[PDB]
Design a protein around this ligand. Structure first.
Ligand SMILES: [Mg+2]
Ligand SMILES: [Mg+2]
Ligand SMILES: [Mg+2]
Ligand SMILES: [Mg+2]
Ligand SMILES: [Mg+2]
Ligand SMILES: [Mg+2]
Ligand SMILES: [Mg+2]
Ligand SMILES: [Mg+2]
Ligand SMILES: [Mg+2]
Ligand SMILES: [Mg+2]
Ligand SMILES: [Mg+2]
Ligand SMILES: [Mg+2]
Ligand SMILES: [Mg+2]
Lengths: 117, 110, 142, 103, 56
RNA sequence: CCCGGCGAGGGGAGUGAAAAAGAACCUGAAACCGUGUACGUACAAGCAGUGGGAGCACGCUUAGGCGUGUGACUGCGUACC
RNA sequence: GUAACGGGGCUAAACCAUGCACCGAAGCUGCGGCAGCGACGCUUAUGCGUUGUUGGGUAGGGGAGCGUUCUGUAAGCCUGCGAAGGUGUGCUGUGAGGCAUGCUGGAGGUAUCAGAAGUGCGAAUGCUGACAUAAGUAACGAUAAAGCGGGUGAAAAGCCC
């Protein structure tokens, strides 16, 4: 029972090459190079599912800081005031309000200031 | 109406022929012929023959209108290469490739 | 929903004029860098230039503490083998006063294409006169 | 008029008529779900929360669909170490359509 | 003496960026015969600047 | 029958179920080399991806932050055995 | 080549003491999902609702699978109203994979449950064929040497006179 490897080998190689579309030069054409690139890409993606969470929180904090200082308080003190006032709105929502509803953000700041007093 | 003429297995490298082909891409047939007449390249002779054949095909097989004809498409493809041997020094042998080309010219009134 | 992103085509930028007379070099620079980057706006986006245009007047009268007038040295290499050149703060102020402020701010801006674009919005003048009256700059005490 | 509520360990700012994708909920397709813990309601004036959750805030929503999200591929690899592992994943979700926000 | 890495097809095209040929641009027309010719050269029929130079 | 050197090669006509089955002939993969179209690219520094992301083109849908292609700018990031 | 804060800069943005905030990891918590191993209640080939807890990994040990060729089931079943092979697209599983379908192709293919293996390749300065790169680059083999008129020819520096 001799087994020829042609049909199966072709299918495996095409699978990897399909995932390498868009890559530069040999990275999207040659199997040896394409395989390494596909593996690397997956390794970055696993790491970046975690990094995405870090970067977005960092962005929200920066926007809250700016909006709060426009109302005359720093981010650090603003967060403390909300905690003392038992407000549980998270940073994702706070950053959204800071950009779209500036009146509502002012009301939040006043509540924080009252609690700190 | 598109008319085609081809010179398959032409004895020239595709690279050399492509230089001449670029000169006439998109030009009117009359202008193209003049350009080729005064190009001092061996490939110019080859390309001119194919262009003339395409013009003749359009006139005889199709509906003529030479004045209206224009070189819509021209490309050169690589043909089969012939392998030869070149003796070098100290008994070593090298391989010589005699490259060929496939010349395609398309002329169209539109 | 997705987090809001500033659009480089719809960013609104304002013009400001600052006087540098008797202001500490470094402390002034940090504020310039913040506003050039746009960190003071709620629409701050790290990949979009959302900052403001800032005119700096009287760059020759900027102040430094300690003995830095005579001891702060600016180094640069020309690219030729020896080519290491030095200039003290006082010498820089005498030859090209605007450079002092520009150099400080550049060191505090992000490096890369976007950072270079942010630097172009800074206009530094050695004297008390500017020619951008058409842009109607607003006084900024910073 | 928008309101903020917490569902699957995450918060969402919504308005009437908007469709929001949440973590899988144990309700049928046509059923109506009510979120009683409203962090904030802002119409003309804004109602905050002296203590978490506005007194009478209720958000009514109708379940729309249950499905799985796009496939993500997990790749683990240790160079020079003869180790490689791959895994797939599709996360369940529940879409709801906000019907009414009650102050 | 020899390369350490294989140059790409991109760099090959960039080197050949200056290999394009130039057309003649204009062909002169003889005043008498009306025959096209390269400027300052005799025509195929032998005419040059109107005169029947050369008997061939 | 037509172009060409009474060439090579090709375009028609005709045969055939099929000639993109034409003798360099079943099927005809990949490397490699071209022509056309969309988008990007001539002040910007590195394993060339990955995470975010504007604009443009083309479909869809009465838009509906949909889909496909491209990817300015930006965080992170020194192949494999 | 500044080159003994990473840099800018700093007279605090340094150091000492005290205090309260905040940032900060794949740690912990929240929400959704999967698997292993124990105790449970039921029910028995168990499974659910439970219930605790556990799941970085080289050499290496243990467990469970995918796919390929061939034999039986099969004188069955699918197929010129289009087989295998090729090339796209959509859907689907935790993975090796699977399924459907457009185009190409033009005659074979094979469920299920079993059985047997020339059963899976990226590396071995592996083996054979094809095709790249350098590159239209070096070179065209004695530095005895050519010039012109005519001829022939589609074309003549090289042939003939
Ligand atoms: Mg010998
Ligand atoms: Mg950096
Ligand atoms: Mg013939
Ligand atoms: Mg064939
Ligand atoms: Mg470079
Ligand atoms: Mg975290
Ligand atoms: Mg954990
Ligand atoms: Mg393990
Ligand atoms: Mg192989
Ligand atoms: Mg040459
Ligand atoms: Mg060279
Ligand atoms: Mg040379
Ligand atoms: Mg010789």
């Amino acid at each position: 029972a001799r087994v020829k490897r042609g049909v199966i080998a072709r299918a495996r190689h095409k699978k990897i090459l399909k995932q390498a579309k868009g890559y530069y030069g040999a990275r999207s054409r040659v199997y040896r190079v394409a395989f390494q690139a596909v593996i690397k890409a997956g390794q970055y993606a696993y790491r970046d599912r975690r990094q995405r969470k870090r970067q977005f929180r960092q962005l929200w904090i920066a926007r809250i800081n700016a909006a709060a200082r426009q109302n005359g308080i720093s981010y650090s003190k603003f967060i403390n005031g909300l905690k003392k006032a038992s407000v549980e709105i998270d940073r994702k929502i706070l950053a959204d309000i800071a950009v779209f509803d500036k009146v509502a953000f002012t009301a939040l700041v006043e509540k924080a200031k009252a609690a700190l007093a | 109406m598109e008319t085609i003429a081809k010179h398959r297995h032409a004895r020239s490298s595709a690279q050399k022929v492509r230089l001449v082909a670029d000169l006439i891409r998109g030009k009117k047939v009359s202008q193209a012929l003049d350009i080729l007449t005064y190009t001092n390249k061996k490939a110019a002779v080859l390309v001119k023959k194919v262009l003339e054949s395409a013009i003749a095909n359009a006139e005889h097989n199709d509906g003529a209108d030479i004045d209206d004809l224009k070189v819509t498409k021209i490309f050169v493809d690589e043909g089969p290469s012939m392998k030869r041997i070149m003796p070098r020094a100290k008994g070593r042998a090298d391989r010589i490739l005699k490259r060929t080309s496939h010349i395609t010219v398309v002329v169209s009134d539109r | 929903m997705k987090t809001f992103t500033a659009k480089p085509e719809t960013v609104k930028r304002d013009w400001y004029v600052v006087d540098a007379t008797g202001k500490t070099l470094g402390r002034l620079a940090t504020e310039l860098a913040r506003r050039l980057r746009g960190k003071h706006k709620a629409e701050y986006t790290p990949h979009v230039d959302t900052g403001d245009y800032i005119i700096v007047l009287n760059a020759d009268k900027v102040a430094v503490t300690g003995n830095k007038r005579t001891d702060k040295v600016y180094y640069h290499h020309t690219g030729h083998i020896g080519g290491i050149k030095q200039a003290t703060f006082e010498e820089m102020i005498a030859r090209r006063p605007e450079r002092v402020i520009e150099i400080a701010v550049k060191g505090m801006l992000p490096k890369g294409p976007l950072g270079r674009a942010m630097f172009r919005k800074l206009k530094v003048y050695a004297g008390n006169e500017h020619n951008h009256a058409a842009q109607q700059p607003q006084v900024l005490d910073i | 008029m928008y309101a903020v509520f917490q569902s699957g360990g995450k918060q969402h700012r919504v308005s009437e008529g908007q469709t929001v994708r949440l973590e899988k909920l144990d309700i049928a397709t046509g059923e109506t779900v009510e979120f009683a813990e409203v962090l904030m309601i802002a119409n003309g004036e804004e109602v905050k929360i002296g203590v978490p959750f506005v007194d009478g805030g209720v958000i009514k929503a109708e379940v729309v669909a249950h499905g799985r999200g796009e496939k993500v591929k997990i790749v683990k690899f240790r160079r020079r170490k003869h180790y490689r592992k791959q895994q797939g994943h599709r996360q369940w979700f529940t879409d709801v359509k906000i019907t009414g926000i009650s102050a | 003496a020899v390369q350490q890495n294989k140059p790409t097809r991109s760099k090959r095209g960039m080197r050949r960026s200056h290999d394009a040929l130039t057309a003649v641009t204009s062909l002169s027309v003889d005043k008498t015969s009306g025959e096209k010719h390269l400027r300052h050269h005799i025509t195929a029929d032998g005419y040059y600047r109107g005169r029947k130079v050369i008997a061939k």
